[PDB]
Amino acid sequence: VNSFSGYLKLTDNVYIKNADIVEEAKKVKPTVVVNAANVYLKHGGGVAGALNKATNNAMQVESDDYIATNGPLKVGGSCVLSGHNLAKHCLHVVGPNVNKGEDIQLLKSAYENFNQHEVLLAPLLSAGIFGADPIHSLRVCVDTVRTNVYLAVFDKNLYDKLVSSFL
Numbered sequence: 001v002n003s004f005s006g007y008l009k010l011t012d013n014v015y016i017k018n019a020d021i022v023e024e025a026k027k028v029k030p031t032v033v034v035n036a037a038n039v040y041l042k043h044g045g046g047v048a049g050a051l052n053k054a055t056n057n058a059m060q061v062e063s064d065d066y067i068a069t070n071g072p073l074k075v076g077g078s079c080v081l082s083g084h085n086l087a088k089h090c091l092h093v094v095g096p097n098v099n100k101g102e103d104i105q106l107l108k109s110a111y112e113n114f115n116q117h118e119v120l121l122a123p124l125l126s127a128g129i130f131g132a133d134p135i136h137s138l139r140v141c142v143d144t145v146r147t148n149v150y151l152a153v154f155d156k157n158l159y160d161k162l163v164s165s166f167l
């Protein structure tokens with residue numbers, strides 16, 4: 001048993017809810033929250049800008065030190081950093097950004113990072129401002145992640161369409 005509440009069960013291991021991931025993280029304090037990161041860990045908008053704002057910019061300060069030491073992530077890659085006031089850990093995962101021309105086949109590689117963690121609170125990778133088909137992102141999630149994932153869909157109209165189209 002875990003602390004996640006009000007989720008619709010899609011599969012053995014994937015759950016979904018219409019929720020603000022920031023507000024969900026603040027309530028649950030999950031072991032792992034996933035950030036929709038870019039390779040530079042520049043947290044400006046969407047999930048990253050919202051998560052970073054909720055940490056009072058401490059996520060960005062920590063991220064800048066990580067990049068200064070290690071250089072940029074790979075598209076499809078990840079790193080584990082602090083969850084600050086939101087979670088124990090933040091798994092920063094880089095899905096491909098369609099609005100930068102990145103290979104959508106890298107979305108499966110991105111979701112494979114989730115398998116290193118038994119339970120996660122996450123957004124749909126590459127959805128919204130990343131320019132990919134969200135319905136596609138949910139299918140790749142279900143067909144790739146084997147650990148227990150609680151998806152927070154921010155946009156209500158996107159949530160209802162994802163549920164009503166789910167195979």
Ligand SMILES: O=C(O)Cc1ccccc1O
Nearest residue numbers: 046127128129153154155
């Ligand atoms: O609603 C979601 O969860 C998907 C998403 C991600 C980023 C920006 C806007 C947006 O709708």
